[PDB]
Design a protein around this ligand. Structure first.
Ligand SMILES: *[C@@H]1O[C@H](CO)[C@@H](O[C@@H]2O[C@H](CO)[C@@H](O)[C@H](O)[C@H]2NC(C)=O)[C@H](O)[C@H]1NC(C)=O
Ligand SMILES: *[C@@H]1O[C@H](CO)[C@@H](O[C@@H]2O[C@H](CO)[C@@H](O)[C@H](O)[C@H]2NC(C)=O)[C@H](O)[C@H]1NC(C)=O
Ligand SMILES: *[C@@H]1O[C@H](CO)[C@@H](O[C@@H]2O[C@H](CO)[C@@H](O)[C@H](O)[C@H]2NC(C)=O)[C@H](O)[C@H]1NC(C)=O
Ligand SMILES: *[C@@H]1O[C@H](CO)[C@@H](O[C@@H]2O[C@H](CO)[C@@H](O)[C@H](O)[C@H]2NC(C)=O)[C@H](O)[C@H]1NC(C)=O
Ligand SMILES: *[C@@H]1O[C@H](CO)[C@@H](O[C@@H]2O[C@H](CO)[C@@H](O)[C@H](O)[C@H]2NC(C)=O)[C@H](O)[C@H]1NC(C)=O
Ligand SMILES: *[C@@H]1O[C@H](CO)[C@@H](O[C@@H]2O[C@H](CO)[C@@H](O)[C@H](O)[C@H]2NC(C)=O)[C@H](O)[C@H]1NC(C)=O
Ligand SMILES: *[C@@H]1O[C@H](CO)[C@@H](O[C@@H]2O[C@H](CO)[C@@H](O)[C@H](O)[C@H]2NC(C)=O)[C@H](O)[C@H]1NC(C)=O
Ligand SMILES: *[C@@H]1O[C@H](CO)[C@@H](O[C@@H]2O[C@H](CO)[C@@H](O)[C@H](O)[C@H]2NC(C)=O)[C@H](O)[C@H]1NC(C)=O
Ligand SMILES: *[C@@H]1O[C@H](CO)[C@@H](O[C@@H]2O[C@H](CO)[C@@H](O)[C@H](O)[C@H]2NC(C)=O)[C@H](O)[C@H]1NC(C)=O
Ligand SMILES: *[C@@H]1O[C@H](CO)[C@@H](O[C@@H]2O[C@H](CO)[C@@H](O)[C@H](O)[C@H]2NC(C)=O)[C@H](O)[C@H]1NC(C)=O
Ligand SMILES: CCCCC/C=C/C/C=C/CCCCCCCC(=O)O
Ligand SMILES: *[C@@H]1O[C@H](CO)[C@@H](O)[C@H](O)[C@H]1NC(C)=O
Lengths: 417, 343, 117, 49
């Protein structure tokens, strides 16, 4: 605490006085990791290894649940020319659980891969597949030029070219109603100013890169605000109660003390929040207990310092302890408890004196000989006196003193500009 | 304020970023410390005008006057007078004793108890240097002073004077011959005693008079609760929670989001300090006036027409209350006039 | 203005004691005052009474207090003991001896009758 | 001060964003209201004796 005062003040010398410091803190001692005990691997072999993909015209949407997202399984043979995460840094994918996970899946032309990202325009972004402005997932794609290509062309892949308006996020439209152009009425018949809305792709093996087919998978998911059943590969640990710990509950990390709670969460609520939106309760993923989480730090400390040019002894006042183990930095032989807190290191005396180095709530301190130490004492209030007040007695001065005293009053400040 | 706890409570990555933006954290505390010191000086200036703590005389024969509701009640463990007891009971403080142990908040309760919620976010309250018992001793001395010595209990050594004579001189001060006090001494004592009884009952029945002291308490409590509530603001960040940012983002991206929250949190703290500082200027002005009235209404006889209540000032007695001083001002008001011819 | 250019009667202005006079002095960024005050000293306790009973009429001090030692009553000013003989010049007469509480019996001196005799 | 009009006058997208940064808008008005009340008290104290 004395050094903390010196750093705060940018000085190697501290004047006699009371200095405030940081609230008393403790460190976490161990890390608790809790995930639901999911044993199945996610269907990477179906999402990325399908015999057939949907056309962008009518894209598929697969729901993923109850699995481990161990994507390292792709490293032995998959290759992805495009990969970008929007709602999470990719390096964090293994410490998190995901919920509401869906994999959209389709085939597009290579020059169209860039239109998948949110905020883009073009025939795919406007008429076939659109991500929302606030998309929170990951987009992955690869060059399937030896799977989706055919020598005479592969005409099984379609895209929408004509529409009267743009799509909203994640909408599909598989209507084949003929498109009317040029304000020229059309009764379902291809012709002048009337078009079948869909067109095929070529995808011959001899086309240049921009015309090779690409497989696109979009993984849409949400993080940290709901129960989750798709979760990364990090291993769990045992849970330790009533100690300061580090933790990870389904991807939500932080530190604090885990205790049993009387809060009862509704079946669909995974986490709670306090008045300032800080998580203060969680449902444990394996045993469904509700735990409260409290901060590890708490308290308040101040240091009683004789000038450092006189002595290096200090006394420390702890505002949040009773001292009758303790949330203190150390315990010495001199422990005094008062209304202002627990004072450790000062000797206490039964005398009273004029105040110096005020502590609070009736207590002051000073550095004294009897071979010197810091002493805590109560304040005097001047000295006691009395009057006679007999009902027939009057005191009258017989002499006087003319005295001169001084008084100082500041008048002005340094003017600045 | 623990300006690190308010911004980066229990978070290493945030705490290290905060070091660069660190001169501001220190500056906020310097201003608050200066205010905190001034508040004890204000209390001392208003009440500690007497270095001689006079005991209540053993003789209660103050003519026909009572004063027992004003003087300390010896049956209590405290030295509060009956009227002070009422004043202390009506002004409500958020809590008392200033100690909450960690174990006391180790549960769901931490989120329901506003004081605990303030402590966990780095906001604390420091105890006053003087206690209620010490203030009661100062008010006791002032009363012993004016009940027995009057004018001269200050400006020199206290001299005793019979109580009736003391008022006789206060009447000459007003401009009424002393003969009135002696001839009407029984009437005067009875009117005084009845007036005190009315004050006692008035204070017992209606607490609205004390709203000024209650307002000081409520305003500070609200400012601290506001700082806790403002923690939820995003300030342009993805989330107001550092843990959400740190879990989902890598360091270089997290740093942007954290910096937005750090700047925003300092903005809340600077706003707080400025408001406390302005309010401190206002409370000081009140304290200076209170000190002036103590000296001019209690330690002497003011002749200022609008001091010490309405009427001609005759005498006064201070009483303490949480966060302030309440005065009982005794004035002389003429009555039942008749119109006469003059020249 | 109130301590230097005039004589304040406010009890807590111009230092402690009764204000008598003052002199300003300047200093960097402010003013320092030298305040001269009068403080009473060396008090003694005397017997007192609110009035004196003469011939049934009650005599009140014109100014000051009626004060006495073991054998005689005198009238003095309040802030500096200076006993004077109680005479009809130094007192108000009103009411009577059956009204004032604490009235004592003490002959009041008539300054003129002995000159006329 | 209508602290919404000053920031997002006639603008829906701005107004909704401002809700997150909303405790500050309220706090400004509380301070101004307190001042406004004091100003009538000042007039009354000087003249209504
Ligand atoms: C996707 O399919 C490929 C085959 O086309 C799988 O890769 C083969 O895995 C076996 C077993 O480990 C190896 O013996 C083969 O040599 C691999 N083939 C190639 C070309 O590398 C791949 O594992 C499947 N991916 C997923 C996620 O199931
Ligand atoms: C959702 O359906 C509505 C209703 O059919 C579409 O709005 C109409 O669009 C046609 C042109 O295709 C206009 O002639 C109509 O006047 C519109 N009606 C209304 C009530 O606005 C809307 O465009 C469709 N949404 C999407 C994304 O396609
Ligand atoms: C420290 O804790 C003790 C209790 O362990 C407090 O002392 C008690 O105070 C109550 C009145 O509030 C008494 O009825 C008990 O008899 C006391 N118990 C003991 C063992 O003394 C003590 O007040 C606390 N310290 C501070 C500064 O608050
Ligand atoms: C001052 O007033 C109090 C009442 O407020 C007087 O105390 C009461 O005295 C009667 C007897 O005459 C008792 O029956 C009551 O119980 C007492 N009440 C209380 C609250 O103590 C007191 O005697 C008066 N003192 C003087 C000097 O007049
Ligand atoms: C001055 O007014 C007071 C009342 O304010 C008079 O005193 C009251 O007299 C009535 C009888 O007429 C009694 O019943 C009350 O008990 C008295 N009150 C008190 C407090 O003693 C007083 O007599 C009037 N004096 C003059 C000269 O008119
Ligand atoms: C002073 O004398 C007047 C009469 O000359 C008393 O009567 C009032 O006089 C005023 C001034 O002309 C009128 O406005 C009122 O209407 C009169 N009163 C009534 C009831 O008619 C007045 O009361 C006397 N003052 C005192 C103190 O007795
Ligand atoms: C006034 O007279 C008293 C004696 O009646 C003097 O003595 C003090 O009286 C008080 C009141 O009873 C006691 O508490 C003190 O202990 C007495 N003093 C001593 C030394 O015993 C008192 O000194 C006289 N005042 C003056 C100014 O002379
Ligand atoms: C009270 O004061 C009076 C006046 O000073 C004293 O009276 C005089 O005492 C001297 C002796 O010291 C005599 O020579 C005078 O003749 C006395 N004057 C009168 C008018 O009698 C008196 O002695 C003092 N009394 C006490 C008890 O101290
Ligand atoms: C001052 O107090 C004394 C008592 O300390 C009062 O003395 C009483 O005087 C009357 C005569 O007027 C006697 O009958 C009583 O016996 C005395 N009482 C005692 C206990 O001896 C004195 O009257 C009071 N003086 C004033 C002005 O109040
Ligand atoms: C002042 O002197 C008168 C006498 O002139 C005293 O009055 C007498 O007191 C006695 C005892 O109570 C009565 O028996 C007499 O009848 C009273 N006489 C008259 C004329 O009233 C009076 O007490 C003395 N006063 C003081 C303060 O000593
Ligand atoms: C020369 C035109 C007039 C210039 C004025 C500015 C016009 C703005 C339009 C720019 C062209 C945007 C084309 C985007 C690519 C669509 C390709 C596709 O989806 O397949
Ligand atoms: C497995 O999951 C069930 C249901 O959530 C739970 O009760 C059980 O304790 C878990 N077990 C382990 C790690 O053995």
């Amino acid at each position: 605490p004395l050094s903390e005062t010196k750093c705060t003040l940018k000085s190697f010398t501290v004047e006699k006085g009371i200095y405030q410091t940081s609230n008393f803190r403790v460190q976490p001692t161990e890390s608790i990791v809790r995930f639901p005990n999911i044993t199945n691997l996610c269907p990477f072999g179906e999402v990325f290894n399908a015999t057939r993909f949907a056309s962008v015209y009518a894209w598929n949407r697969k729901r993923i649940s109850n699995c481990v997202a161990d994507y390292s399984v792709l490293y032995n043979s998959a290759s992805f020319s495009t990969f970008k995460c929007y709602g999470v840094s990719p390096t964090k994918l293994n410490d998190l659980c995901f919920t509401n996970v869906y994999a959209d899946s389709f085939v597009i032309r290579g020059d169209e891969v860039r239109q998948i990202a949110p905020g883009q325009t073009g025939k795919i972004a406007d008429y076939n597949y659109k991500l929302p402005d606030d998309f929170t997932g990951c987009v992955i794609a690869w060059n399937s030029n030896n799977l989706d290509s055919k020598v005479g062309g592969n005409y099984n892949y379609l895209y929408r070219l004509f529409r009267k308006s743009n799509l909203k996020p994640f909408e599909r439209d598989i209507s084949t109603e003929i498109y009317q152009a040029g304000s020229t009425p059309c009764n379902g018949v291809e012709g002048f100013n009337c078009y079948f809305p869909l067109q095929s792709y070529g995808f011959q093996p001899t086309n240049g890169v921009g015309y090779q087919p690409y497989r696109v998978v979009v993984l849409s998911f949400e993080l940290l605000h709901a129960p989750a059943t798709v979760c990364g590969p990090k291993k769990s640990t045992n849970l330790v109660k009533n100690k300061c710990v580090n933790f990870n509950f389904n991807g939500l990390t932080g530190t604090g003390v885990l205790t049993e709670s009387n809060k009862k969460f509704l079946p669909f609520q995974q986490f709670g929040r306090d008045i300032a939106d800080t998580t203060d309760a969680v449902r444990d993923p394996q045993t469904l207990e509700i735990l409260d989480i409290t901060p590890c730090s708490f308290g308040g400390v101040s240091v009683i310092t004789p000038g450092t040019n006189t002595s290096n002894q200090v006394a420390v006042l702890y505002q949040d302890v009773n001292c009758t183990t303790w949330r203190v930095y150390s315990t010495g032989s001199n422990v005094f408890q008062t209304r202002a807190g627990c004072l450790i290191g000062a000797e206490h005396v039964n005398n009273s004196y004029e105040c110096d180095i005020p502590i609070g709530a009736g207590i002051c301190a000073s550095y004294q000989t009897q071979s010197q130490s810091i002493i805590a004492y109560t304040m005097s209030l001047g000295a006691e006196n009395s009057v006679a007040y007999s009902n027939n007695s009057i005191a009258i001065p017989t002499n006087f003193t003319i005295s001169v005293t001084t008084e100082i009053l500041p008048v002005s400040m340094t003017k600045t500009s | 304020v623990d300006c690190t706890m308010y911004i980066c409570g229990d978070s290493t990555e945030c705490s290290n970023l905060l070091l660069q933006y660190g001169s501001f954290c220190t500056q906020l505390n310097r201003a608050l410390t200066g205010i905190a010191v001034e508040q004890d000086k204000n209390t001392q200036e208003v009440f500690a005008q007497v270095k001689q703590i006079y005991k209540t005389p053993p003789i209660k024969d103050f003519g026909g006057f009572n004063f027992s509701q004003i003087l300390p009640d010896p049956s209590k463990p405290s030295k509060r007078s009956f009227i002070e007891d009422l004043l202390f009971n009506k002004v409500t403080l958020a809590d008392a004793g200033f100690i909450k142990q960690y174990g006391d908040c180790l549960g769901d309760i931490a989120a329901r108890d506003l004081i605990c919620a303030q402590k966990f976010n780095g906001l604390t309250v420091l105890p006053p240097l003087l206690t209620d018992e010490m203030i009661a001793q100062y008010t006791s001395a002032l009363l012993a002073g004016t009940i027995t010595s009057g004018w001269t209990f200050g400006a020199g050594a206290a001299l005793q004077i019979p109580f009736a004579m003391q008022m006789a001189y206060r009447f000459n001060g007003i401009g009424v011959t002393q003969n009135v006090l002696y001839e009407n001494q029984k009437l005067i004592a009875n009117q005084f005693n009845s007036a005190i009884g009315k004050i006692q009952d008035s204070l017992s029945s209606t607490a609205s008079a004390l709203g000024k002291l209650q307002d000081v308490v409520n305003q500070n409590a609200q400012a601290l609760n506001t700082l806790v509530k403002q923690l939820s603001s995003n300030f342009g960040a993805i989330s107001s929670v550092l843990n959400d940012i740190l879990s989902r983002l890598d360091p270089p991206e997290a740093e942007v989001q954290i910096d937005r929250l750090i700047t925003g949190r300092l903005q809340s703290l600077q706003t707080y300090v400025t408001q406390q500082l302005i309010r401190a200027a206002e409370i000081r002005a009140s304290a200076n006036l209170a000190a002036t009235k103590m000296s001019e209404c209690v330690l002497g006889q003011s002749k200022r027409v609008d001091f010490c209540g309405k009427g001609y000032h005759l005498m006064s007695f201070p009483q303490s209350a949480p966060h302030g001083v309440v005065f009982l001002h005794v004035t002389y008001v003429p009555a039942q006039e008749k119109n006469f011819t003059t020249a | 203005s109130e301590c230097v250019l005039g004589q304040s009667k406010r009890v807590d202005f111009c230092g402690k004691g009764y204000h008598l006079m003052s002199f300003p002095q300047s200093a960097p960024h402010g003013v320092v005052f030298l305040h001269v005050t009068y403080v009473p000293a060396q008090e003694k306790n005397f017997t007192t009474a609110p009035a004196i009973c003469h011939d049934g009429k009650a005599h009140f001090p014109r100014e000051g207090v009626f004060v006495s030692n073991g054998t005689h009553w005198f009238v003095t000013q309040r802030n500096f003991y200076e006993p004077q003989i109680i005479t009809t010049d130094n007192t108000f007469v009103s009411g009577n001896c059956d009204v004032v509480i604490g009235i004592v019996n003490n002959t009041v001196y008539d300054p003129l009758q002995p000159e006329l005799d």
